[PDB]
């Protein structure tokens, strides 16, 4: 009765091609600017901008029709690169969109109501392994193609020509060049500009594509002044650029933060200077009097050119990556946030905002997970320094070779994310770096985003030396599982080169929400329980046995345990009972368990399963000594002690499995675990890997890593479901892509999470007059 069904949405899937872009955004509007056609990795979303909802999705698994283009195993780099508005084949005749992914697969997708099940899966001849773009105007569409050196691609401008041979589009081969380090297209597409690197120095060209009009090249050594002839490469290096639609103005945003403006005929130099970090986002208006700029500071800054001044937008809560205006009269700013508070994933954030009061309409998220390391081609953006958030200019080949060969020669690849599920409304919390993301996966979006520290997350853009002021990372938060409290615990760091910079220090607090609001109010905080400088790593919440989920027992890596129960005579949270066995050793590989009726407390220390009672906080030493065994000892270093119900149990160590019965105080069964995992985990991570059902056990997940023919970029989910304390392998669900965690949603189902972040689940005459008046309505 169980089966794989991958359901919910994932990443926005932009042009994740380092310098192979000038736009890196094809989230288009209709020509009636009311609905937003945005691609994903998992869907196509059509949004009503007047309500910020989805009027129609085109999911990437519901049709084999489309997903023959992308449902394969290792070639899942089928990313989506261009959207046009009308039928390309027929001349302008009604409104259904066309779609190109990275392989030149022409798709003609339906746009209104319900789709017709014949998408014209057209394909041009040469588009075998490429698509940079096509560029659009009336009639003529001109494809930018890439062939193969010094790590420079070759860009060619061919034309889609299609007049009467109704089953073949043929290219027309206008332009050729073989050297690109950075390129860009205009906001109307009628002009582009690239660089060439061709030594007596590097050079920059600006070319037309729809005529013979303006085709020129010039070395940028003239644009580089004597100050940047002298000083370092962060001043010599172009970070971003922009061109005008007219063809008389070229912005070059240099990596220091200066924004040069050069002309076309006379080639003057003109300098714009406010940005302190590097600049990544440069675009002109359609009239070319305002220059939109977004850098690593959290501000959206737009320059009026004929005053050379600026209007700000202070707190975008992230890092701006690309921005332009795209209204035909120029009323809508499309842009990409990134918010690199987690360096693991390139988790962007698509949004547009009005030009009226700069209010944001339809912040389009993906699910933003909290991994442990970089995933699969996760490069870092170009800053001036090799900071903790990104690498510098000189470490491009260095960091890409380091990450690629690290994933080749590594053996430690867990990145197991911790989440939670809310028993009020069944949305899943991604506890972010010093924050949360409450994702309601029923319609694959968010609801809010609360900050969870009193740090420097919000009120300051992180600049070149403040980037190493990382924010206090939270580890986890516990729901009171009536859905009432976020009991969060977080670790915090100081800036380095300080005597108090040694320790990473700890703080917990308590959050209450009503069912009305989506935020949480802070009830109380507790700064370093169990004394100072002690981790509080494993805390367990309680069922409705004691006071309708008021029990939360805090633990330690040292092995101390305290009990914590809410009360109302003291309108506050406080503790109940105290224990700190101060071992002079420590071990952060600790699990815990607790009985669902409230009887047994299980401390799974470093290979000793000590047993306390509930009532008196101590080791149960009764008055009989007839198999009242209140201390187990397991085979090796364990990571989980899990109780599925009050009779039997699963403990998990590094090498094998074991099952325990406690009414019948013995061991039961065993499965192998080291034939599955080699060295993949860090200690304590099997706890957040597997999570029990209320009835039907748990799903131990096989961690695999598919070898080359070192691991290649094929991956696994061959998950085998277990029922009722290690009894049946009743389903081996096969899948070609990775996994991080599996949780239980309360309809006896098991939601799993992909790294390519797709959430899924294994679970259970007057009529003619009326019609013609409906046609005459508009």
């Amino acid at each position: 009765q169980y089966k794989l069904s991958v359901v919910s949405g994932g990443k926005p899937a932009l042009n994740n091609l380092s310098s192979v872009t000038g736009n890196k955004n094809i989230a288009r509007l209709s020509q009636d600017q009311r609905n937003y056609i945005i691609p994903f990795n998992n869907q196509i979303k059509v949004y009503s901008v007047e309500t910020r909802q989805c009027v129609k999705t085109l999911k990437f698994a519901n049709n084999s029709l489309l997903s023959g283009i992308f449902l394969q195993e290792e070639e899942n780099n089928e990313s989506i690169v261009k959207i046009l508005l009308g039928d390309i084949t027929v001349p302008q005749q009604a409104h259904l969109i066309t779609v190109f992914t990275n392989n030149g697969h022409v798709i003609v997708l339906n746009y209104k109501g319900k789709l017709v099940e014949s998408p014209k899966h057209f394909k041009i001849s040469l588009a075998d392994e490429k698509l940079a773009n096509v560029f659009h105007s009336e009639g003529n569409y001109r494809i930018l193609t890439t062939f193969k050196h010094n790590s420079l691609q070759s860009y060619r401008l061919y034309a889609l020509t299609f007049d009467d041979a109704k089953k073949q589009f043929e290219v027309a081969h206008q332009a050729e060049w073989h050297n690109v380090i950075l390129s860009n297209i205009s906001s109307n597409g009628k002009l582009l500009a690239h660089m060439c690197k061709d030594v007596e120095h590097k050079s920059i060209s600006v070319v037309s594509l729809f005529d013979d009009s303006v085709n020129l090249s010039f070395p940028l050594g003239s644009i580089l002044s004597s100050q940047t002839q002298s000083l370092s490469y962060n001043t010599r290096y172009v970070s971003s650029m922009a061109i005008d639609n007219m063809g008389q103005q070229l912005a070059v945003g240099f990596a220091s933060g200066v924004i040069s403006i050069v002309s076309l005929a006379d080639l003057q130099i003109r300098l714009l200077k406010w940005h302190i970090d590097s600049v990544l986002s440069l675009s002109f208006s359609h009239d070319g009097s305002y220059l939109l700029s977004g850098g690593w500071e959290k501000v959206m800054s737009l320059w009026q050119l004929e005053t050379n001044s600026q209007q700000f937008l202070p707190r975008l809560n992230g890092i701006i990556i690309d921005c332009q205006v795209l209204g035909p009269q120029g009323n809508y700013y499309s842009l990409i946030l990134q918010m690199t508070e987690n360096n693991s994933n390139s988790d962007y954030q698509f949004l547009l905002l009005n030009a009226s009061d700069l209010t944001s309409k339809l912040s389009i998220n993906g699910p933003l997970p909290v991994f442990n390391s970089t995933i699969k081609h996760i490069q870092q953006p170009i800053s001036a320094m090799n900071t903790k958030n990104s690498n510098s200019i000189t470490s491009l080949n260095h960091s890409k070779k380091k990450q690629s060969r690290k994933l080749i020669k590594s053996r430690r690849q867990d990145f197991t994310t911790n989440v939670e599920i809310n028993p009020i409304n069944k949305n899943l919390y991604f506890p972010h770096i010093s924050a949360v993301q409450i994702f309601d996966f029923y319609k694959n979006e968010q609801v809010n985003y609360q900050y969870l520290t009193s740090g420097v997350n919000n009120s300051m853009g992180k600049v070149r030396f403040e980037l190493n002021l990382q924010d206090p990372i939270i580890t986890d938060l516990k729901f009171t599982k009536d859905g009432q409290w976020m009991i969060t615990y977080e670790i915090e760091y100081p800036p380095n080169d300080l005597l108090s910079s040694k320790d990473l220090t700890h703080i917990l607090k308590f959050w209450t929400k009503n069912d009305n609001e989506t935020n949480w109010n802070l009830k109380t905080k507790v700064i370093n329980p169990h004394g100072i400088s002690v981790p509080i790593t494993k805390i367990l919440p309680s069922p409705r046995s004691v006071n309708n989920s008021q029990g939360c027992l805090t633990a330690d890596n040292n092995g101390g345990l305290k009990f914590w129960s809410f009360d109302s005579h003291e309108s506050n949270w406080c503790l109940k009972k105290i224990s700190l066995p101060n071992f002079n050793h420590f071990s952060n590989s600790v699990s815990l368990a607790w009985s669902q009726d409230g009887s047994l407390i299980f401390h799974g220390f470093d290979d000793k399963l000590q047993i306390l009672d509930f009532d008196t906080f101590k080791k149960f030493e009764s008055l009989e000594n007839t198999k009242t065994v209140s201390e187990f000892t397991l085979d090796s270093e364990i990571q989980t002690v899990k109780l599925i119900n009050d009779t039997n149990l699963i403990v998990a160590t590094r090498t094998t499995l074991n099952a325990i019965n406690l009414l019948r105080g013995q061991v039961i069964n065993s499965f192998d675990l080291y034939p599955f995992v080699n060295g993949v985990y860090k200690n304590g991570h099997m706890d957040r890997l597997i999570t029990c059902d209320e009835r039907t056990g748990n799903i131990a997940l096989v961690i695999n890593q598919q070898l080359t023919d070192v691991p290649t970029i094929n991956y696994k989910s061959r998950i085998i479901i277990f029922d009722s304390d290690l009894s049946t392998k009743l389903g081996n669900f096969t899948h070609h892509e990775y996994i991080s965690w599996i949780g239980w949603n309360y309809d006896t189902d098991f939601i799993f999470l992909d790294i390519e972040s797709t959430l899924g689940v294994v679970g259970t005459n007057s009529d003619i007059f009326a019609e013609q008046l409906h046609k005459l309505s508009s």
Binding site: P581, D597, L600
Partner: protein, 548 residues
């Protein structure tokens, strides 16, 4: 599923009262009663009585007589009140009701004319019951239930003659059908090893359970779901479980089949005619504290042989789970042959255990984690190496690295060989703090003592250390404190342990003042090496020299 087991009318009171059981007796006239009092008069007795009941006040009692009637008796005053003989066949197991709770004239023939606890308060004739043999009176909404050998189940309530429910319950010849403590079921015992709890809301068997020992007298206590089953040839009542606010411990019901073991409390000494010794003192069933001891209906010590995955052909998609021997030899036949080789006819030499450890599974002369280990195989291997064979070089370097020895390690203080004891006091985590404490309070003070103090801080809790060191020989600790005051942080935290263990006053002043000087140079070395730790333009005119 059992509880704490021991012990090898008025149905709610107990001792300190007048007479809570004027109880019927087999091989007597009808009945008798005894105090640990009141009279036991004639209630139109002298019949085939096997049971007896009253009006639960011990002054208007009766004697349940097999003549279809129940006439009142006088047990306190002497003025018995009149009654009415209803049936004419057998009422030797009759019982009066409360003030209009449950009374009907279904004596032995299913003739259930409903009435009250009176002779003149009569109700409608609910005589539609078939030929039944199991008549029970429960207090859910007071209800007489009939299980019939025409097999059927039914229940009626004596409020306005309301037949609640009933179906065709296939009830055969059983042993003991008591009601359940939750009142919505009944433990109806099958003959030898079985007692089915049947949910008495629809006469359906809800859980047909098996019994660990012989079940002959099953009676459900004033508990959550606990019953007592007394065996055939004994007065032993096993306490099993499947009323929670003030849970009763004794004087719940009067039912057993032991050696005249009626009036069944936990302390069932004061009986009605028996006058016997006493038994259990256990309360009702707890939440989850009794079930960790009460391991009945299943008693075994077993484990699987580490079952692998359901074989996955992935020779094109290998898992990167080893560069070494992933699937090792878990051959129990090879392990049995190797252990029989170690305890075989070569046993005169240490080669008999060395070559057996070689011909056993791939343990690299010291290393665990090839868990070729069932509990019986493990303890027989440990017995053949702990027999009358510190000798072997492979096996006794393989066994400091074992987390499982489980209390035969009292021998470790007595056996005194240096390097095996050093490996055992650094690695194997089964050597208790008693042995650790006397080996610490040895006064030869070498790296053995350093390593066991490191082990006491690596494994042993401070509160157990304190309450174990509270009462021991004072001469060892005072001699060691004098030695260390004359002439390392493991020893200083052990000094903290013993100098919290000293108590308040039970010492002298000169030795402790010299210890105060020792700890004065301790505070000065502490402050001086933490000091070591956190230690670790142009003026107006000058006269210049330059060459010409």
């Amino acid at each position: 599923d059992y509880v704490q087991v021991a012990d090898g009318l008025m149905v709610n009171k107990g001792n300190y009262t007048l007479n809570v059981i004027t109880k019927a007796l087999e091989d007597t006239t009808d009945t008798s009663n005894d105090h640990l009092d009141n009279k036991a008069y004639t209630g139109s007795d002298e019949f085939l009585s096997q049971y007896k009941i009253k009006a639960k006040a011990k002054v208007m009692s009766i004697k349940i007589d097999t003549k279809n009637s129940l006439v009142i008796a006088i047990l306190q005053n002497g003025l018995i009140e009149i009654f009415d003989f209803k049936l004419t066949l057998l009422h030797s197991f009759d019982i009066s009701y409360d003030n209009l709770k449950y009374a009907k004239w279904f004596t032995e023939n299913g003739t259930e004319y409903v009435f009250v606890l009176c002779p003149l308060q009569d109700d409608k004739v609910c005589y539609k019951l078939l030929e039944l043999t199991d008549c029970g009176s429960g207090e859910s909404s007071p209800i007489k239930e009939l299980s019939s050998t025409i097999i059927e189940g039914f229940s009626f309530e004596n409020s306005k003659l309301c037949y609640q429910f009933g179906k065709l319950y296939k009830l055969n010849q059983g042993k003991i059908y008591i009601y359940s403590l939750p009142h919505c079921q009944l433990q109806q015992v099958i003959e030898f090893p079985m007692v089915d709890k049947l949910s008495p809301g629809d006469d359906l068997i809800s859980f047909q359970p098996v019994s660990v020992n012989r079940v002959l007298l099953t009676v459900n206590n004033v508990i959550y779901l606990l019953d007592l089953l007394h065996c055939s040839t004994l007065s032993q009542r096993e306490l099993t479980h499947v009323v929670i606010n003030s849970e009763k411990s004794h004087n719940s019901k009067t039912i057993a089949i032991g050696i005249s073991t009626k009036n069944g409390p936990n302390p069932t000494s004061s009986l009605e005619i028996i006058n016997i010794d006493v038994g259990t003192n256990t309360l009702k069933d707890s939440l989850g504290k009794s079930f960790q001891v009460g391991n009945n209906d299943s008693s075994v010590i077993l484990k699987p042989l580490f079952d692998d995955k359901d074989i996955n052909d992935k020779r094109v998609k290998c898992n990167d789970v080893s560069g070494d021997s992933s699937v090792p030899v878990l051959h129990c036949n090879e392990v049995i042959e190797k252990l029989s080789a170690l305890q075989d006819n070569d046993i005169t030499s240490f080669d008999d255990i060395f070559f057996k450890e070689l011909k056993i599974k791939e343990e690299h002369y010291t290393e665990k984690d090839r868990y070729i280990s069932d509990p019986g195989f493990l303890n027989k291997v440990l017995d053949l190496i702990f027999g009358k064979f510190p000798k072997t070089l492979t096996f006794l370097l393989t066994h400091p690295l074992f987390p499982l020895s489980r209390t035969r390690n009292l021998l470790s203080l007595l056996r005194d060989q240096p390097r095996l004891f050093k490996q055992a006091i650094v690695t194997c985590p089964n050597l208790p703090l008693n042995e650790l404490l006397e080996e610490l309070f040895s006064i030869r003070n070498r790296e053995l003592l350093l390593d066991i103090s490191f082990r006491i801080l690596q494994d042993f809790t401070r509160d157990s250390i304190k309450q174990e060191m509270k009462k021991l020989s004072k001469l060892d600790v005072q001699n060691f404190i004098e030695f260390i005051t004359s002439g390392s942080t493991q020893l200083f935290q052990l000094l903290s342990l013993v100098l919290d263990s000293i108590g308040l006053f039970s010492l002298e002043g000169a030795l402790l003042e010299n210890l105060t000087l020792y700890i004065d140079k301790q505070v000065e070395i502490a402050e001086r090496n933490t000091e070591l730790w956190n230690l670790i333009a142009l003026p107006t005119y000058t006269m210049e020299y330059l060459d010409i």
